[PDB]
């Protein structure tokens with residue numbers, strides 16, 4: 001199982017512009033509270049700041065990244081998210097969108 005989202009790299013904070021049907025179902029949020037916002041709303045006090053830093057750098061460098069984060073649902077309950085980010089580039093070498101595949105690997 002996996003979910004899928006899209007971020008807009010032309011905007012400075014990479015706001016999500018499209019989320020799959022499982023993303024809203026897995027996390028507990030709805031489009032009205034997801035679109036236009038950075039994905040970071042899923043994090044909490046248990047999220048490893050070293051792992052978050054890896055995604056922050058790969059987004060600035062415009063390269064791919066894969067991390068294991070402790071994300072939280074809308075009801076505060078935790079789940080473990082195997083996140084993979086991939087830069088989508090235009091022909092001129094510039095990054096237009098970031099794409100994310102989230103897998104709930106809490107087992």
Ligand SMILES: *[C@@]12=NC3=[C]C([C])=C([C])[C]=C3N([C][C]([O])[C]([O])[C]([O])[C]OP([O])([O])=O)C1=NC(=O)[N]C2=O
Nearest residue numbers: 007038039040042043052055056069098099100102
């Ligand atoms: C999040 N998924 C997700 C999907 C995409 C396509 C991108 C680009 C990022 C994420 N994040 C990370 C978040 O947007 C942000 O980049 C990081 O928090 C690091 O930057 P900051 O400014 O916060 O230091 C995802 N983060 C999650 O926790 N869960 C995901 O599903």
